[PDB]
Ligand binder design. Sequence first.
Ligand SMILES: [Mg+2]
Ligand SMILES: [Mg+2]
Ligand SMILES: [Mg+2]
Ligand SMILES: [Mg+2]
Ligand SMILES: [Mg+2]
Ligand SMILES: [Mg+2]
Ligand SMILES: [Mg+2]
Ligand SMILES: [Mg+2]
Ligand SMILES: [Mg+2]
Ligand SMILES: [Mg+2]
Ligand SMILES: [Mg+2]
Ligand SMILES: [Mg+2]
Ligand SMILES: [Mg+2]
Ligand SMILES: [Mg+2]
Ligand SMILES: [Mg+2]
Ligand SMILES: [Mg+2]
Ligand SMILES: [Mg+2]
Ligand SMILES: [Mg+2]
Ligand SMILES: [Mg+2]
Ligand SMILES: [Mg+2]
Ligand SMILES: [Mg+2]
Ligand SMILES: [Mg+2]
Ligand SMILES: [Mg+2]
Ligand SMILES: [Mg+2]
Ligand SMILES: [Mg+2]
Ligand SMILES: [Mg+2]
Ligand SMILES: [Mg+2]
Ligand SMILES: [Mg+2]
Ligand SMILES: [Mg+2]
Ligand SMILES: [Zn+2]
Lengths: 111, 71, 47
Amino acid sequence: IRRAAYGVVRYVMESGAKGCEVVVSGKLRAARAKAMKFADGFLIHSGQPVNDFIDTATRHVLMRQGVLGIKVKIMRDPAKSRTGPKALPDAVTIIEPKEEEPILAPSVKDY
Amino acid sequence: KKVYTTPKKIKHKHKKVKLAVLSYYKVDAEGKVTKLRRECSNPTCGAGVFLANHKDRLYCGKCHSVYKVNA
Amino acid sequence: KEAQADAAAEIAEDAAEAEDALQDYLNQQANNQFNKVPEAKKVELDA
RNA sequence: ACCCACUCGGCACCUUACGAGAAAUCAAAGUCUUUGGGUUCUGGGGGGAGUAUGGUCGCAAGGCUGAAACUUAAAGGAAUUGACGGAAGGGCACCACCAGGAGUGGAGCCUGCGGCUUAAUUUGACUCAACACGGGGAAACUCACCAGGUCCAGACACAAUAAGGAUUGACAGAUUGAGAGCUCUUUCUUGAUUUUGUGGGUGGUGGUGCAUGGCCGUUCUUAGUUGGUGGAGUGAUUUGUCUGCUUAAUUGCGAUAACGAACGAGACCUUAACCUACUAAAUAGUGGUGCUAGCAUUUGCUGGUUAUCCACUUCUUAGAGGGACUAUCGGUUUCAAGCCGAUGGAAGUUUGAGGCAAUAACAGGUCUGUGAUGCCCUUAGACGUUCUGGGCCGCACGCGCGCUACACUGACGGAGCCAGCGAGUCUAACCUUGGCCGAGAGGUCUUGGUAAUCUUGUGAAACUCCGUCGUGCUGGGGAUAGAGCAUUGUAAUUAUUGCUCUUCAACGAGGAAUUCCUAGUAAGCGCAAGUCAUCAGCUUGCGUUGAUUACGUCCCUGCCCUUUGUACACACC
Ligand SMILES: [Mg+2]
Ligand SMILES: [Mg+2]
Ligand SMILES: [Mg+2]
Ligand SMILES: [Mg+2]
Ligand SMILES: [Mg+2]
Ligand SMILES: [Mg+2]
Ligand SMILES: [Mg+2]
Ligand SMILES: [Mg+2]
Ligand SMILES: [Mg+2]
Ligand SMILES: [Mg+2]
Ligand SMILES: [Mg+2]
Ligand SMILES: [Mg+2]
Ligand SMILES: [Mg+2]
Ligand SMILES: [Mg+2]
Ligand SMILES: [Mg+2]
Ligand SMILES: [Mg+2]
Ligand SMILES: [Mg+2]
Ligand SMILES: [Mg+2]
Ligand SMILES: [Mg+2]
Ligand SMILES: [Mg+2]
Ligand SMILES: [Mg+2]
Ligand SMILES: [Mg+2]
Ligand SMILES: [Mg+2]
Ligand SMILES: [Mg+2]
Ligand SMILES: [Mg+2]
Ligand SMILES: [Mg+2]
Ligand SMILES: [Mg+2]
Ligand SMILES: [Mg+2]
Ligand SMILES: [Mg+2]
Ligand SMILES: [Zn+2]
């Protein structure tokens, strides 16, 4: 239940995702229902960027013992956005100035 | 729940009987075959099928129901 | 470790798949081909 | 007597820690693996047990000395973190109060819940977080209940039966609620499709939401979670993440062994506001002109004319941009974040309102949404399924959401007459204008519309006006009931709804209790949508009219936050 989940997470992460999340709900071998979260990197859970970046799916895995949930959540690197906004609304970048060589009594050139 | 009341008296579906069937084609002697049990008049029935004999009754079975033919 | 290496083969199967490597008949018309006669008998209506 | 310094010896306290400890902490509990100044006593897992036995002391109660068999894998220490507390201290909010509004609670009915009744009155849910909830407005269906009647749609595997017939169907008649061959009478038909048995399946609104997925509700009208380098601890951990300050907010400011960060809040998204500036429109609309009617005449005033043209985009529409960032100035505050007032502004209460919404928790609800499902039960006299009728509406009563009233800020009769969100018919009968007929309900002949084009300007209602009524249960109120006509639907009886007449109840402002709310809000009003053949007193939206009162506090309640205790950690069920 870990080896599989953690395996997925590694492949998705290595596929360039900004982040991803794997949840398993159900019952394995123990009569009581338990659940695990598996998550790495970066994810936002709120706002419009939700629709924009994270992709989710749920899947019912039917087994001998019963049925488990697979909820998978993958977040995509907003830089690569192609068609859409290329960063979270969060992001604010200041452009970096350049060293100056001031003074220089005025003169002038000609053409 | 409740589990089984009932007033006895169950039912049975059908036997279909046994009936060695066609001994009915009457010969006379050797070898003429005079063919008892008259045959039906409708195109779906190719005269292979016949009519049953009851009181007031001549009935085609090949017609599951249709066409009472009375004589 | 067994999960990380699990994704070693997921890359392998993914990287080796980036390159990697008539019964004429026609039963629609065969009933039209077999349409040939001497396939039946019809005679009836006595008495 | 008092003050200063110094020194012996006291009772103590403070700060450090070289050092010690498992730690809490310790100037001894320090100078112990770098282990030795002298000396006395006691302990050797937890129970059994300070019990039994002996000896000894005592008047006694009892003191000293003091076992074992057996049992058991932990008991125990200090500290960390959670959970909880009928501990302390700080907050927050009309699901808290204050200041008020409008009410419910009383009345009639409507509806749901309990109860009783019942052949059955199917069932889930019971404080906020059950009870106008399951989209739950049930005449058949729905349907899970009850009274009775059919069918297999029992795959498939082996076996048995049997081509001399394995099996299928039915006319009439009996029968039956029934033109069900259900069953039976008689006897035609059918042709390996079925049948019988076992194994194995299949359906089930059958059980289990205390076996689950998923979904949802609640905690939460909340503000919390985490990691990088650094500081502390042997360690679990901790500091960061904090007294105060400020914000709706772990929102910030400031203090600071922390610095600088990420999820959540914020940003973001939608919708309602603002564009005489950009792009446009006979499916939106204005101006001008032809055509054209009425009144006045002196040029005018008020209409008609889906294309007779010309021009335009203020109004309508939606693409693209602009705009607000609490701006300007000024008060107050660590002159910090902020806060408040004033001017300007479409807009200054997170601009108003929503959508989205971290970690975590519940044995919350849902197996009665699901061909999502484990397992259990059932599976032909069925808990499958279908047909007929009944029931979910049954009525001494308790509870809850509502609706309509008690009238003169009113009923009633004329008449003025004003919105917005929606919806609407293809292999079809949806939205319906208009002309007739009818008191009405409605009927009939037609017509536009797959819709910014037609219904429709949805001429809605409250409201405004002129009258009739005059405080008298009155003409307020419309329960209950009789009688007739219509509509939906195969079916209306236990009366689907609609109309007309008559009948004319309770209720004269409602005890203890208790809900909801701070601006286009409350409340009053009707409309559209869902449901829908018919049925809204329900719900989800919408616009119309439009106040009184706060702008605060922790008193009640509820809930967070520290502090503190813990022998809980399945965490006070
Ligand atoms: Mg964020
Ligand atoms: Mg947000
Ligand atoms: Mg130390
Ligand atoms: Mg009050
Ligand atoms: Mg009151
Ligand atoms: Mg309710
Ligand atoms: Mg029925
Ligand atoms: Mg049948
Ligand atoms: Mg069988
Ligand atoms: Mg069996
Ligand atoms: Mg089912
Ligand atoms: Mg139950
Ligand atoms: Mg549960
Ligand atoms: Mg669940
Ligand atoms: Mg509020
Ligand atoms: Mg803290
Ligand atoms: Mg415009
Ligand atoms: Mg102003
Ligand atoms: Mg429970
Ligand atoms: Mg379900
Ligand atoms: Mg009911
Ligand atoms: Mg009036
Ligand atoms: Mg008439
Ligand atoms: Mg009266
Ligand atoms: Mg009246
Ligand atoms: Mg009153
Ligand atoms: Mg309706
Ligand atoms: Mg309802
Ligand atoms: Mg503690
Ligand atoms: Zn025949």
